[PDB]
Structure formats: C-alpha cells, structure tokens
Amino acid sequence: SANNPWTGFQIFLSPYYANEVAAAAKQITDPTLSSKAASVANIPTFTWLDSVAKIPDLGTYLASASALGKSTGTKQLVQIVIYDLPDRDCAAKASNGEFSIANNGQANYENYIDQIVAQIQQFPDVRVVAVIEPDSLANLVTNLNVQKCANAKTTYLACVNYALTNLAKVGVYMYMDAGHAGWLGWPANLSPAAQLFTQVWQNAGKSPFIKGLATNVANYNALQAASPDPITQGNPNYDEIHYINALAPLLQQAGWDATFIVDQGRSGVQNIRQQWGDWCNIKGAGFGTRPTTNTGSQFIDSIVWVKPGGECDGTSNSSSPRYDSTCSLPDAAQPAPEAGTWFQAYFQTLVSAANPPL
Ligand SMILES: OC[C@H]1O[C@@H](O)[C@H](O)[C@@H](O)[C@@H]1O
Ligand SMILES: [Cl-]
Numbered sequence: 036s037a038n039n040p041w042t043g044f045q046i047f048l049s050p051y052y053a054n055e056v057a058a059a060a061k062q063i064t065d066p067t068l069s070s071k072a073a074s075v076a077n078i079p080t081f082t083w084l085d086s087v088a089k090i091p092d093l094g095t096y097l098a099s100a101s102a103l104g105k106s107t108g109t110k111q112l113v114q115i116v117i118y119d120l121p122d123r124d125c126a127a128k129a130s131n132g133e134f135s136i137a138n139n140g141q142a143n144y145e146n147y148i149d150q151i152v153a154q155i156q157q158f159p160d161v162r163v164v165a166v167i168e169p170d171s172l173a174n175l176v177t178n179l180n181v182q183k184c185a186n187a188k189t190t191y192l193a194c195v196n197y198a199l200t201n202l203a204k205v206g207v208y209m210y211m212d213a214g215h216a217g218w219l220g221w222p223a224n225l226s227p228a229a230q231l232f233t234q235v236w237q238n239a240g241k242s243p244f245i246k247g248l249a250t251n252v253a254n255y256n257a258l259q260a261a262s263p264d265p266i267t268q269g270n271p272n273y274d275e276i277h278y279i280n281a282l283a284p285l286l287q288q289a290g291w292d293a294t295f296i297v298d299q300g301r302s303g304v305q306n307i308r309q310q311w312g313d314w315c316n317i318k319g320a321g322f323g324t325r326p327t328t329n330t331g332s333q334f335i336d337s338i339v340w341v342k343p344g345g346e347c348d349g350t351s352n353s354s355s356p357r358y359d360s361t362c363s364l365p366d367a368a369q370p371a372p373e374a375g376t377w378f379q380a381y382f383q384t385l386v387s388a389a390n391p392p393l
C-alpha cells in the first residue's frame with residue numbers, strides 16, 4: 036500500500052524492554068556477550084498492554100516520544116499490543132488474564148480500551164501502531180471446539196470490534212493478529228480465516244487505519260525458510276511468506292487489500308521443535324531478523340519484534356493455576372517462570388543464538 040506506517044518515522048524504543056534488557060545485560064558475564072545483549076535495547080519492539088495497570092505507562096511513552104521528536108526534529112512512532120480480552124488465551128492456560136467474561140469482562144475490556152484511547156488522544160503528534168489481541172481471532176478459526184473459546188466467541192468479537200472502532204477515532208494504525216503459518220496457513224484454514232477477518236473489518240466500518248494483519252506473534256516460524264522445517268509436513272505453507280502469499284488474495288477478493296507485519300524476534304533458529312504446536316519457551320531460540328521495512332514482499336509492511344524475547348510464555352510449575360503442559364515439553368526451557376515475567380537464561384540464549392548475529 037502507499038502508506039507504510041513506518042516510513043518517515045523514528046520508532047520510540049520500548050522503555051519497558053530497555054529496563055529489562057539493561058538489567059539482564061549486566062548479569063551476562065562475558066563483556067562482549069554483554070555488550071551485544073545491551074544492544075538489544077536499541078532494537079525496536081512492541082510494548083504489551085497486558086493489564087490495565089499499564090495504561091498510564093502508555094501515557095508516559097507517548098509524552099516521552101513527543102518530547103524526543105521535538106528534541107530531534109523527528110516524527111516518533113509508538114508500538115503497542117492490545118492484549119487484555121476477558122477469558123484471554125482461551126485455548127491454553129499460561130496467559131489467562133485479569134478479566135473474565137462471567138464477571139463483567141466485556142464491560143471491563145471496553146473501559147480498558149476507553150482509557151487507552153483517552154491517552155492516545157492527548158498526543159496527536161505521535162503515531163501509534165497497535166497489534167490487536169494476539170491469538171484471539173486465530174482461536175476463533177480453529178478452536179471453536181474448545182468450549183472456553185466457543186463460549187468466548189461473541190465476547191471476543193464484540194471486544195475486538197470495540198477496540199478497532201474506537202482506536203480508529205484517534206488514528207491508530209492497526210494490525211489484527213492472524214496466527215501464523217502453522218495455525219491459519221494450512222490451506223484448509225485460509226478461507227475460514229479470511230472470512231472471519233473480513234467480517235471483523237466490515238463490523239469496524241472498514242476504517243483505513245485497519246491496515247491488515249500481524250503474523251507469527253510470539254512464535255518462531257521463518258519468514259522465508261531455506262528448507263521446510265520438518266514440523267511443517269503436510270502443509271505447503273511452511274513459512275510466513277507462503278502463508279501471507281496464500282491468504283492475501285482471499286482478502287483482496289473479499290474487498291480488502293490488507294497488508295501485514297511479521298514477528299521475527301524469536302525466529303533466528305529454525306528446526307528446534309518436535310511438533311509445530313509447541314509454542315512455549317522453545318529452547319535454543321535465537322533473536323531473528325531485525326525490524327525493517329525491507330521485507331521481501333508486496334504484502335508485508337514490516338518485519339517487527341512483537342513478542343519481546345526474554346519475557347516468558349508460561350510457567351513450567353504444575354502447581355500454578357496457569358500451568359500448561361506445553362510449557363513442560365521436552366523442547367520447552369525448564370524451569371520457567373510465569374508468563375510475562377523475565378526469563379534471564381532464555382534471554383541470554385536468544386543473544387548467543389541470534390541469527391543474524393548481534
Ligand atoms: O511478553 C509479552 C506478553 O507475553 C504473554 O505471553 C504474556 O501473557 C504477557 O504477560 C506478556 O505481556
Ligand atoms: Cl473443551
């Protein structure tokens with residue numbers, strides 16, 4: 036498309052991740068891995084609004100970006116993830132969140148969106164790019180037999196619609212999460228996915244701020260694999276560019292020339308999983324291609340780092356209410372702390388295994 040949200044902007048670096056990385060780098064005991072680890076804080080990432088408590092930090096990021104832009108004569112761009120649906124993470128245990136459908140979840144969620152909108156409205160010289168609700172829509176394509184997801188469907192659609200509709204009013208550029216090649220990229224899932232994304236786009240009034248879709252968020256797939264990972268057997272769409280190339284024409288037929296962003300923050304090391312569905316703290320992952328608008332594809336606006344590597348995907352402790360057996364598989368790094376908390380050993384391996392190297 037003509038308007039790539041990133042062109043002409045300088046990305047505001049996540050202060051949240053910067054603080055995690057600075058603390059982590061000081062604990063890496065070779066001075067050269069430590070300098071490479073510290074350099075990660077200069078790589079743009081998405082900051083997750085995974086609880087309502089963080090909304091005031093969004094406010095600080097916007098105001099800090101505005102001042103940095105003025106001090107430098109640049110236009111600044113803040114990257115966020117909207118991730119607080121009620122009955123969040125409906126097909127897994129590790130990332131259940133603060134809101135529940137049974138306890139006013141939708142009303143709570145819409146209040147969370149209102150508070151985000153109210154922050155963004157105050158800083159019109161800062162651009163915002165938001166990834167909308169990782170996993171939610173993909174779960175509504177393949178996981179309607181999961182009763183928690185079935186029972187969540189109407190609420191998820193309402194909440195996502197509220198987010199899209201209201202963030203559009205403050206000019207936020209949005210990419211709705213769309214799973215990954217091993218999830219929605221199976222040829223047989225492409226059309227049900229496109230049909231859902233089309234519905235969602237229509238219900239939010241087709242705002243031009245809804246740019247398209249995000250893929251591979253918090254996953255590990257290649258964008259363009261040298262050879263298919265053996266986990267992909269049976270699926271000709273073995274990497275994200277095959278998935279996107281196959282999905283985008285369906286969206287175009289349905290009236291929407293969508294564009295895409297692709298997470299590569301934990302994609303540096305391929306062929307490290309037993310099964311494709313192994314998503315949790317996959318051992319040996321490395322930082323992948325750095326964010327760039329040099330994407331290799333007409334459909335892809337940017338390679339991005341959405342999941343911030345080093346932040347855990349889920350606990351391996353089976354005494355936790357958030358224990359998911361995926362997080363104690365043989366290819367899952369163990370022991371692992373709660374999802375969203377820092378996992379130092381995992382970060383250092385991401386640094387050592389980075390490809391391209393840091
Ligand atoms: O690290 C990014 C996000 O990862 C998710 O798996 C966690 O549930 C969130 O708490 C965190 O914000
Ligand atoms: Cl079930």
Ligand code: NA
Nearest residue numbers: 129130253348
């Ligand atoms: Na997750």
